[PDB]
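notes to self, project folder thing:

trying the whole complex as one job this time. last attempt i did each chain seperately and stitching them together was a nightmare. two parts in total, labels are on each line so i dont mix them up again. if this works i'll redo the older ones the same way
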Amino acid sequence: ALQYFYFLRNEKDNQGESMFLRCVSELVIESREFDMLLGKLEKDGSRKPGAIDKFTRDTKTIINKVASVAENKGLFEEAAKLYDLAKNPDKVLELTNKLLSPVVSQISAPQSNRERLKNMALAIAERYKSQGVSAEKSINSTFYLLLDLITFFDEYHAGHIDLSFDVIERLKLVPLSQDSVEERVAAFRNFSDEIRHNLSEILLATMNILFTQYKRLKGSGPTTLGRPQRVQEDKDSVLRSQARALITFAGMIPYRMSGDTNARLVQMEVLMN
Amino acid sequence: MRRSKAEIQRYVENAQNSASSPREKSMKGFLFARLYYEAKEYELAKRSVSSYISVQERDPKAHRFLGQLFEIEGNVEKAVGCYKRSLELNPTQKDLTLRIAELICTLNIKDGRAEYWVERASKLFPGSPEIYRLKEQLLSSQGEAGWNQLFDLIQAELFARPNDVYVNLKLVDLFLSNQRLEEAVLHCLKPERRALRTDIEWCSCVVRVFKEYLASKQGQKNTNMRMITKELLLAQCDVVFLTLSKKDVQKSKEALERFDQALLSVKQSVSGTDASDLSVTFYEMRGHYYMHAGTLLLKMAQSCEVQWKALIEPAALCYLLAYQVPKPKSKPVKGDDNGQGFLEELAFDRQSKSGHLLLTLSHGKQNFISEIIETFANQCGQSILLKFLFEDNLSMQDSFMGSDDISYVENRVPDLSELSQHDNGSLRIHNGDLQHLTWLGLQWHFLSTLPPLRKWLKQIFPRVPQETSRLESNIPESICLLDLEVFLLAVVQTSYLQLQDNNTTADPNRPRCLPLPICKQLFTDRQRSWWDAVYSLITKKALPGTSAKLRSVIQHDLTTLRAQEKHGLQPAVLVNWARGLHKTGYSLNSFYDQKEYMGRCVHYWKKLLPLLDLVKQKKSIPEPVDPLFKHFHNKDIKVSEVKDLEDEACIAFATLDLVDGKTEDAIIAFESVKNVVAYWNLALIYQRKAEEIENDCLPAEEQEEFQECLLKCKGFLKMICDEYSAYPSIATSLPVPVETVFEMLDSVKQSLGEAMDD
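result (full assembly):
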């Protein structure tokens, strides 16, 4: 392979890219192996002088282009491993978010292998961020946001309500009160496309948890079956505050979605109102 | 070493296959039996250690392991024989007698030889819980001959280690069973019992013993009786404090009722010829009962019965009464100074906390007592307080608070000087702790005034009186009060942010800063250990040998507080620290304090420069890798201020050079550095120089220099205005406001003149 690449690299560019680059890209995407040709990996190590690296330079850019081609084609785990070998936290977190965004819309219960794949990818990304320099400030903020969001998602899917409520209260990023709607809107202007798109599922899960809590509160007796009237009034007041903050946010943000989502938003607003 | 049984067996068989000789097999039998014990294979461990002992009669650890395995299994006689032959082989073991005693106790057949061995071990060692339990199990089936030895061992252990709460409780129980109250009273009269007061059951037993002694000796009034009454009241107060700390309501109400009954009983002797330590402890317990009633009201509001909006006023009145409780008076006949000092310090702390809480809750009031006296004459107020506390169970005459009114105590108002004096009195016995310091900082921030942390740290640390020589270098020897002030400000800001996030809700709001029984610690164990190590290293209380370990433990957390990579706080908080340090070093007019402040600021800036470069290049942020809480992007620095931060570092360098004694060099450095803050400092220095020249003489050269300085200041203000109008990123980091800049430019132009101005 290297003996043929030594002759293929002699040709210059011909109508974009190069025939040698196209051939090596096809070969690597057909082989899917790089532990000795490009470099071994313990868990998140750097690159090693492989066979092609001991003869040709620009190995970092070559690996980056190969991983980009694989991502454009439809590869996830191998592209992530290649970028981890080439040491690129920005691209690693970018591909991680791009692969975990569409799965957020669907269920997150352990039913197939996509959840295990996203879990191992998140673990690899977090260990790479712990051992070495991570990504940019906004990228790390989005990573932490997505981590907290998938944590709340799995906590809600597992059947627990109080855990989801307390984690969504400790997140300190949902509209709390009217004085917090201002800073929430101010911070919303510095988000991203994924952070604006997953808000639909976030609000759906939040309204589901709130409706479950309200149904449990209505099933529980006001004076009997526990839960004193003062506790019921305090819960009703905190629900009023949360609904007012959420509706003020959704009304004064410069973004609209769909009629069904809007109707459900107002439904939860008046349910907690 | 501890894994699965399958892995243990696989390792054992691999080692056995690797061993090619029975001698080596029996030699590795030690680790074989160890792995057998970790995997719960007692018979195999026993046979392995037996083969090891048979092939080598050395190492007492193997004999001890064999004895432990025999005790676990059931070969008491074999274990005793093995221990005896091991002691005969090597008589240089002390725990072998304890192991023999444990084996005999497991056999449940006590022996005189074991009794003598444990007696020898107790005569050798100063005391041990193991030997205590051994003696208890041995003499639990003997008689008075064993009871005497047990009492002697308990006395020896109490003389050795005074921190023996369970031992003291067992001794008191044995005394009460054998009908001996004098020895129990003599043991409870010790001064260390105040510190031992930690278990509610032990405190209740002490209270019962003291009540029995009082009922038996009712008829004498001496200093011993005063001390016994004070200890009884302290134990009752500790019981009430524990009930308020733990989550309940009925237990706290019963404890408050018992405290009120004890106070009503002691009020009979209060009104007598007792006007010294007895009255001091009576006022102390009255203030403690007021604060405990407030805490019980808060606990009931937490358990949901009456809301905070209706229970704050009774709690505020109780705090006001506790603050108005008279101070401990003097005693004409001394004798209980060790208790009088503790009571005085407790009064100091109570007055401090009550005044601080009342000030934070009222925001300025003093006419409430006068209005109550003029309206209800305190009688209806006390009746309402009793009805809110004890409902309708206790009558008005069955409590000491029903007969007393607000006019019975003093009528002093919480003042700043009194609060500072009480805080100093509390600190003189607290010896420095970050909890109350953060609490006082939060109180000062709520009162909207700067906290005097300088004098507090000066009186805490008797070695650093705001005078140090080491400023730079990340070393533990360069630790001054500025790092401690920065840490205290960090904890205060964290607590304030937590309180602000908790208050932003429709839930019924709580008063600011919850009391101690309902407020857990917010710091971390690592931070507490670092603070303790720093205190021990500064106060010269280290040990010859552990100094390097203490310095390493200090540096492990100082590498983050010294503004270096891999943080635990926030870059915006570090920038605020640096700005506050520079402001405190530039606004004063001393010498040594300003030099230390600017040196610490210069060190922080020169250590943060890599983080500033990283923020400029837009890379990683301080990830939560260290146990130093966690924040968000709302308190983080931006990317359009890295040049401003570098220029502020250069400004700090130039200010340090100016104070060192290089005025012209610092002026040249300030002129070379391009920054709005640099030009503002240049204008301030030029104004100060012009004032000094006008105060002194005015030669031709000095007049020309002053004119040139005024022209340079005018040009710097003009270029500041131009940069603010052009580059919008400079407006995100502005020292003095635009109005202040404009008024300074106007004053400079008016002092200079027209025509020549621009």
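what i see at first glance: The interface with chain A takes residues 304-305, 307, 501, 504-508, 618-621, 623, 625, 632-634, 636, 639 of chain B (CB under 8 Å).
need to look closer tmrw
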